[PDB]
């Protein structure tokens, strides 16, 4: 069986410019605005513990597997460190799952996961935790809220709708309130996502006798409206393959199927033609789709 792709871009490593690396930014004070995070600049390839540069308030660990921030006695409180893990391009308006392993959380941190925009590879990177619904909508976590709070450590899913293309972030907040009396670690890993978009349905299908166009009008019941990535196959009534076509992005509808003049001098009267729709990036296949063949509604001529 045809799985997902992941499409995490996770190489466990500081280096900006270095494929998959990933940001890492603070907040003094808690507050909803966050700028890149420091680290000595000799040491940002380093293996372990890396501290926040001259200031020594929080260290930040990564590796291939995770990624970690320790917040020092010296601290002022409240103060928050986020991650930002980034993804692959993602597709606008697909679905997309989220795993993790929420790590160690010691007493005194509280965590938030958001979605937000990718990790731009620049030591001058910031965001915002509000900008998240720039971005995605229907975030989601199996059985938790967002915002800071205590969490159950262990397998976390969070699940939301792209707004927008290209490669966004999974943000992985922590914060302290109060100044800390030792050293404080939070630690998340294994990090996964994969498309799970639904396959769009077949709403309508127009196919005459003779002619080549066949129009199918597709519809969504999850509410997606960019179709992009799904393969649609036409079979004939024997259920031999016509023709398969990839829909683009935003194509609108109706999407335009051309037969070879064989196959249209082929259609039968009233032929059942059948529709299978396969999301080519989540792999998910739709049930299967009929439409008769007709008589083009098109004026007599004499
Ligand atoms: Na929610």
Redesign the pocket.
Known sequence: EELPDDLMNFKGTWEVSADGSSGRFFSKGATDSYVFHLIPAKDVKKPGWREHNEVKDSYIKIDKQSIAARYKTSTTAPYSVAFKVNTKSLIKDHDYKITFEQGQIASGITVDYRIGSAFNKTTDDSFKISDESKYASN???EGEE?GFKQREQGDKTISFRTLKEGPMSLVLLSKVEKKPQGDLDVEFKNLKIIDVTNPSQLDKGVAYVGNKNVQLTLKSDDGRTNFEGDEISLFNSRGELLQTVTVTKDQQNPISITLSEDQAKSLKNKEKLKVSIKQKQSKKTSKDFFFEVGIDPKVEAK
Do not use: L, S
């Open positions: 975030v989601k976590i967002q």
